Design a protein around this ligand. Structure first.
Ligand SMILES: [Mg+2]
Lengths: 219, 216
């Protein structure tokens, strides 16, 4: 099958550089127009760049002209996006896509028919910081929770009882304030199971090599 | 640039009913029969999927319940009957001119019966107080529709600064929403007041749901 696999995204300081790669397989890469499309944190799609099959012709909007360069190595079946003079607003999920000629009723059109999984690019001056994990303790059901405060960057992962508690869980999207993220997670369990049995919030923050287990005890 | 404006920005449709999304282009995106209008479907954590190409042609594996129509500067995407796994972000896109442009996107959700929130309040933990901070957390779980009003009161006076709210996405099982409200104070200000209250006003009732605790 056609496959596109992006890599190279990460956390970069403003004004820095970063090169994204997209490894293609399952088709004759050198025959196809390739593009980059990004999705902002507001979940909106924006076209980034496009390059012809042989690399002779490139296209890009004014917002990235002079800062981003699209290129390709047909010998390696790989698409590239070299980014420089990065700004905070460049933060987005970057996707590579293939433009294919698909027949219509009378003729045909080129449309972006295959996409990669995307690679995340975050441009920020914020310092990497581990989270503080705090317990949230209070009929047939009882609601407990976990407050994950003051970390950077995203993401964190929250589980309950190492994944034994999967239903009745609400983990809320993180919110950025003063260059630090904060989120909470709630879990609802039968009152007969807590505090008679232990309930524990498991927080992982890979960027700070952090694994925290916080037991929820009454009061 | 060819600017694409979608309407509406968000849409809640009951299962089995019609979802209609509009896309208007500032210039014609058709040239001699050939239409350069495409529609994309994107679910959270997944890349965009080519749904409709050339205004009215079905993408790969796209069921007959999806149909595209329109010409020139006015295009529409119709989903009928609505099914549960159609919830996604939908984008129109044109490739007639460089720069290629996308519509602003339309968030399609499931419309279900209204449900009141289940509200819980939590005082600052002893561990956080040792650090010098004080966060009060209020969970508003499993309600519909999405918009809801939370009012914090400290000793009976409304508190707006220091309040951060976060909505979950629509639950893929019961189509409800949940929301957290977090009030962050310094430990000093927290210990200078007695009663803390989260008041939830939802269209399910004019009477607000009030959860409270005394710092005691
Ligand atoms: Mg809705």
């Amino acid at each position: 099958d056609v496959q596109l696999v992006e890599s190279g995204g990460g956390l970069v300081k403003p004004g820095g550089s970063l090169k994204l790669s997209c490894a293609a397989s399952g088709f004759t890469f050198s025959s196809y127009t390739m593009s980059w499309v990004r999705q902002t944190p507001e979940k909106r799609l924006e076209w980034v760049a496009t390059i012809s099959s042989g690399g002779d012709y490139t296209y890009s909007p004014d917002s990235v002209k002079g800062r981003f360069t699209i290129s390709r190595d047909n010998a390696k079946s790989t698409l590239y996006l070299q980014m420089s003079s990065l700004k905070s607003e460049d933060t987005a999920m970057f996707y590579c896509s293939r433009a294919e000629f698909i027949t219509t009723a009378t003729w045909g059109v080129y449309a972006m028919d295959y996409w990669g999984q995307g690679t995340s690019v975050t441009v920020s001056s914020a310092k990497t910081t581990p989270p503080s994990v705090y317990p949230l303790a209070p009929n047939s059901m009882v609601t407990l929770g976990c407050l994950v405060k003051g970390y950077f960057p995203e993401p964190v992962t929250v589980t309950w009882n190492s994944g034994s508690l999967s239903s009745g869980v609400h983990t809320f999207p993180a919110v950025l304030q003063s260059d630090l993220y904060t989120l909470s997670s709630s879990v609802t369990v039968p009152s007969s199971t807590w505090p008679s049995e232990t309930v524990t919030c498991n927080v992982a923050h890979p960027a700070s090599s952090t694994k925290v287990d916080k037991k929820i005890v009454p009061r | 640039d060819i600017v694409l404006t979608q309407s509406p920005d968000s849409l809640a449709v009951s299962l089995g009913q019609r979802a209609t999304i509009s896309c208007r282009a500032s210039e014609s995106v058709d040239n001699y029969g050939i239409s350069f209008m495409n529609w994309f479907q994107q679910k959270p954590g997944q890349p965009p999927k080519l749904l409709i190409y050339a205004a009215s042609n079905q993408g790969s594996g796209v069921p007959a319940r999806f149909s595209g129509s329109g010409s020139g500067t006015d295009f529409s995407l119709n989903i009928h009957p609505m099914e549960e796994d159609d919830t996604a972000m939908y984008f129109c896109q044109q490739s007639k001119e460089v720069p290629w442009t996308f519509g602003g996107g339309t968030k399609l959700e499931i419309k279900r019966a209204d449900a009141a929130p289940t509200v819980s309040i939590f005082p600052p933990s002893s561990e956080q107080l040792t650090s010098g901070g004080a966060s009060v957390v209020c969970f508003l779980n499993n309600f519909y529709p999405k918009d809801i009003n939370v009012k914090w009161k400290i000793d009976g006076s409304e508190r707006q600064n220091g309040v951060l709210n976060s909505w979950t996405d629509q639950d893929s099982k019961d189509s409800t929403y949940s929301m957290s409200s977090t009030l962050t104070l310094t430990k000093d200000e927290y210990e200078r007041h007695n009663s803390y209250t989260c008041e939830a006003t939802h269209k399910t009732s004019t009477s607000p749901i009030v959860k409270s605790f005394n710092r005691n």
